[PDB]
Amino acid sequence: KIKTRSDALQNLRSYIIYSRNGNSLNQEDALIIEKAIKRAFELEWQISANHGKRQISKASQEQKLQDISYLLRTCVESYILLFREPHILALLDIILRHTFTANGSICEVVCLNFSKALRLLLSHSPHLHHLRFSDWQSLVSYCCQAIEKLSKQEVVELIYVMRSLVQWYAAPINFVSEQLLKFFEFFFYAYTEETDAHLPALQCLFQLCAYAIPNCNDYSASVVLLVFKILINSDKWKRLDLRLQLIQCLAISYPLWSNSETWDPHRSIRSFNLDLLNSSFFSLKNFLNFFGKRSSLSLANFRFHTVEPKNNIAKLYDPRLHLFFHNSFFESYFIYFFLAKLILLKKTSQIEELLLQAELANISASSFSLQLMVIITAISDNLTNDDLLSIQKMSLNFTEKKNELQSWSFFILFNICYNKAYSSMLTTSCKKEILAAASRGLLNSVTSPVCYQILTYFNMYRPLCFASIFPFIKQQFILFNDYSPMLSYEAIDYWKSLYILLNENLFVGQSSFKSVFLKWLKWHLYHLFSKEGELPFFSFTDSSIIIFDLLMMIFYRPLSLSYITTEIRSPFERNLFHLKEAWSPVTLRFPYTTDIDCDSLQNVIKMLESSIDEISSASYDKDELDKETPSFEAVMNLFPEVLSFVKSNHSYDPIINCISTNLQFTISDEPKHLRYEIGSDLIRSTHFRDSNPLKTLVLYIMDMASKNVFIIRNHQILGLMEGSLEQIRNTDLFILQKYIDYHDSLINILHLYPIETFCFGMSAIGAYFLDVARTSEPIFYKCLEILAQKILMNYDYERDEVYLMIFIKIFQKCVHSKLQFTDATLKLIVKITKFIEKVFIETKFSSLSGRQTFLKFIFQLSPTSHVYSKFDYQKLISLTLKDSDVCVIYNFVDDLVIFLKKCDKTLIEGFVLPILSIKIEKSLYKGFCYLYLTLKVFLSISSNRSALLYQLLKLANSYETSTIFEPLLRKLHIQSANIKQLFRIYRLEIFWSFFLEFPYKPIYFSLSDFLKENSDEIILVLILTKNITLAKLITSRMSVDFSEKYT
């Protein structure tokens, strides 16, 4: 009743509190009370139905609804505390029944708790994913109603969690493409002024539109037109913090926009985009997002291309990108550049003649100019004249070392060195002129970094000019100011050593100059950081052990130098929150193709290490000393280890020093990556064998004792930023602790790490999962079984995407010879496989980002190799072929290659039957283009070759084939042989099962060779030696002499 509702709210709060305090009342009793509460909510629905006929206190009815909502808040606290499968299902179904569309209005007083608990409680997947896909559709309908109800103020608070759950551990919303479009339209209808869901819902929309872009690009075009409206919408408003996500979404369109550049999404869209780019600069008036000049681009390097737009299409190479992973400051400022790049992206390919001079060309515009010389230059195809005109302004800027010069130097030198073409001999000394600015840096450490880093080498790096600097390369260094860490590390010395190693090219005293440089390396502002500004080659960086081992390679000895196995071991770690935002979508994109001296140095180093000043520098120099000790053993230092132990004892407070120590352990692994001290030895990790064994590891014993200190799922994101990387390194250290100790102890340790906590390190934990404490099979088998028993101890945790995916990935670590064990491993493997070939995946309800990995594991499941999948892997493959996903589409593209040398005759025929399908829709979505790719692979597959030819005949409607031209020779390097499609079997024998039988539209675009070939073959076509029927009625179409045919 009306008053009974408030009485129930008070009684529920009091009873829940009293039961929780006493703990005598059973959680089963609490679940029964929750069932009674759901019954009371159903009674509330019945009372509303009764009030429909005759009015009984309608305002008091809403008041009773609010009171029952308070009672439901108490009961929801109880349910979040304790959840039973029938009870959780009852609560969820009551929540679902709460939404009444028939009424046309809802109090929504209890609406706050629902989605918040859904995202917060019962996360482990039996309870959560117990709500099936139909429940997700119902949630979509509820969100659609909320869109009309919100701004229902609490509908926004619920929609926050709704957007959090929209792209889930498995989200089939994009699978519901009509529902996907409807929900996208609903989301676009409320361009929210302020919403925590705005960024996550827009990100889910961006991922879905990215999926829609290659396959069914028509829905992608509808979404893109909506985004075109949203672009001017963003051009209207101004709020920088939300503008971060707004620009993120605009950039999500931006790869698709660059796609649409070739064939205009709108021919006039460029001018509108230019206006919106002016609005983008206006929004970027926030000086926080600023110029890329001195972005400080930590860890930039040459010989590996850049990823600023993060699209492989550019082929632009190695721009020194702001690290943005420092703990990632510049990315949002880099966001400003994208806005600039956006206007730079804007042809209004059309601005160059005017964009040459008019622009103020500020540093904020200068970074955009660098982006121009990369990408707009890629899209430019500028002739010699345009480059001749453009280079003049940058050259003049370089002439005067004014404020215009410094921000220019990097981009200008990059444009000079890297371009569409090369240059003439006239600019020869001009490189030294370029070198002058770098010479300027060689003493001026501040502006130095790029100059001393890039284009200080390129003349050496590209042997495209006269060796005039053969005397002049050391000339700037001749200032006795060569020793400079001001730039990207080790570049100058290493490149110079290589260059002078040409042919008597080092026949000069410059080896002594290198010796002086190394001596400076020994004491370069000894025991402390020299400078405070921008920290290049900093102690702040992890290490460059290659420099430590370098000197011998720098030394010229007869065939003695050089090594292998650099082993970065996740050094860049570009992953970052606020960088991980676009990264997981940016992880995958598969658009359809279109358009004794060293002994002396070490001896002095001992005395140098006898004194130290700084602590972070202590870590850096400890790494240097340990690497030299590995380097010395290569030439052949427990004292450096003792010094590092002292430095560690100094950092007694935090564990991030132990994180630096884990970096040093990764350094040992990189020394271990080197075969041994002598090198080129069959022994692996022998170079770090002393580091690992207690001998020469007395200080490492102390570090291991430090490691012995006790101190949704943690693998939250498939595309995971750092910290999850920190979790991976932490698990590595966990392994390292027991490794130094010399499992049941490892079992108790992984028990100390919570299942949710230990869920983070997929590859890291999987490595130990493959590892066995002893060679005895039973112990490792029992440990793996205990791991499965812990994952399924809460069957929901096993049901969770994180734990099951961890098991799936660890299976690949278990994918090996495994000769010793032959007992029950397959049984537990199948017990896992029941939901490893996920029951969701079996129902095609698996993860989208997880879908490609699932196919990769299914291929990694190799029935043909040794042991077949007892359950038909062919059946799963056929279901997946019926199944549809863009990641699964690229997986299907790869599966044709995977089929080769892996098709057992029965399995081959089973796949061939699925390989046979005449599909119309997937061609525009390129799914049937993937089928045509499989058909070309079948042309590469002699097995069922006649079937391959039949599938060639039936596979192509020729829709998009003419423009494709064997994917412009990508599918077939020489199409013309099969462009005139008369295959060996096809040309020699008329294609047949053994009204025109040949489909002209599937055959070719024009009459071309098709009609004449058919006319020529008509004689064999009529009598096709499989039946006498083909002769009949052939003469009616032939309109030729019958007597001649009979002859």
Author numbering: 15 to 165, 200 to 373, 377 to 399, 417 to 663, 682 to 722, 756 to 830, 855 to 885, 891 to 1142, ...
Please share text taken word for word from the publication where this structure appeared.
The ataxia–telangiectasia mutated (ATM), an apical kinase that orchestrates the multifaceted DNA damage response, is the master regulator of genome stability, and is a critical therapeutic target in cancer. ATM/Tel1 kinase functions as an obligate homodimer with a highly dynamic N-terminal helical solenoid domain responsible for ligand binding and a conserved C-terminal FAT/kinase/FATC domain6. However, the activation mechanism of ATM/Tel1 in response to DNA damage remains largely unknown.
Previous cryo-EM structure of the ATM/Tel1 from Schizosaccharomyces pombe in the basal state has illustrated a dimer interface and the consecutive helical solenoids inhibiting the kinase activation. We show that ATM/Tel1 in the basal state adopts a symmetric dimer configuration with the kinase N-lobe suspended, keeping the N- and C-lobes misaligned, and the PRD fully ordered, blocking the substrate access to the active site. This structural arrangement likely accounts for the significantly lower affinity of the CHK2 peptide to the basal-state ATM/Tel1. Upon activation, the Spiral shifts upward towards the FAT-Pincer, and the FAT harbors a coordinated conformational change, with the height reduced from 200 Å in the basal state to 164 Å. These structures were resolved at nominal global resolutions of 3.6 Å and 4.0 Å, respectively.
